[PDB]
Structures are given as structure tokens and as C-alpha cells.
Design a protein around this ligand. Sequence first.
Ligand SMILES: N[C@@H](Cc1ccc(OP(=O)(O)O)cc1)C(=O)O
Length: 157
Amino acid sequence: SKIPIIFGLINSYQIHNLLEQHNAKTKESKAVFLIRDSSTYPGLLTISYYCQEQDIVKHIRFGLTDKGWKTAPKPPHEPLKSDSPEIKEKYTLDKIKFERKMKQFINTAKKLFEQHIRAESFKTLIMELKIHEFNLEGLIKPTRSQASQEKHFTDYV
Ligand SMILES: N[C@@H](Cc1ccc(OP(=O)(O)O)cc1)C(=O)O
């Protein structure tokens, strides 16, 4: 009857309210966090947490590699209406780079996501959270109705 510790596809409003409910805004950055299905890249996981320094929710994507869960390629900074041509020119190269890296990354991550549903992959997720310095005590646990339906996480309890 155990509930996975991974959230399914939850919306941005709900992400913010879950972090606030668990007092993320009176605790250090990453002391409170949740783990959820990536909405953009199926097979990836996204860690959402509160950044005290910028007063915003931030998100970090992880994917399966042969070594276990690892950080996914990070996208460039979003375009802004004030961007100079120099910013825009750099964005072009960085986006192409991100797209090529992410494509290779998901090609491997999605295959591992599919083959090993009965998985010792769970321990490597805990390892990568520790490397990122997420306080494991501050993990927000989904309720049954909000937990991920993906079979890879059935035993992520
Ligand atoms: N905000 C992140 C990118 C990001 C955005 C959304 C996100 O969630 P999802 O996987 O559901 O798209 C994860 C990561 C960054 O700029 O590095």
C-alpha cells in the first residue's frame, strides 16, 4: 500500500503551494523540495525547490545514465525583450548546443527508464540528491492521488 515519493504531472501553482505549505520560505534553499515527473521531457525527473536568494521556485532536471540518475543538460537563459544582438547571437549557439545534448541525453535516459522498472536505480537518485545538497529530511511526499503513475517509480518508496 506504499505511495511512491515521486509526484506526477503537477501544475506550477500547486508546486508553489506545496513548497510554501512545508515552510520552504522560512528554511534554507533546498531544505524543502519535491521530485516530480518532468512535464517537458518524458522519462526525466525534475526537482523543484525554493531559492532564498532570488525569492523564486527553481527546477533541476535529472535523467537516467549508465551510472544512475544524473543532471540533465541545462538550457540557456530565456530570451528577454531587452536582448541586444550579442545576447541573441549567443542564445542561438547555446540553444543548438542544449538541443543536441538533451537529444543524446534523453535517448539514453528514456531507454533506461523503460527497461528497468524493477530497479536498483533508486539508490542512485538518493546519491545525486546528496551531491546537490538537498536535505533528504525535507523531501515533500505526494499523496496517493498526486503520486507519479509511471511504473519505473512503483518501488521508489
Ligand atoms: N528553470 C530551469 C529549466 C527547467 C524548466 C522547467 C522544468 O520543469 P519541467 O521538467 O516540468 O519542464 C525543469 C527545468 C532552468 O532555467 O535551468
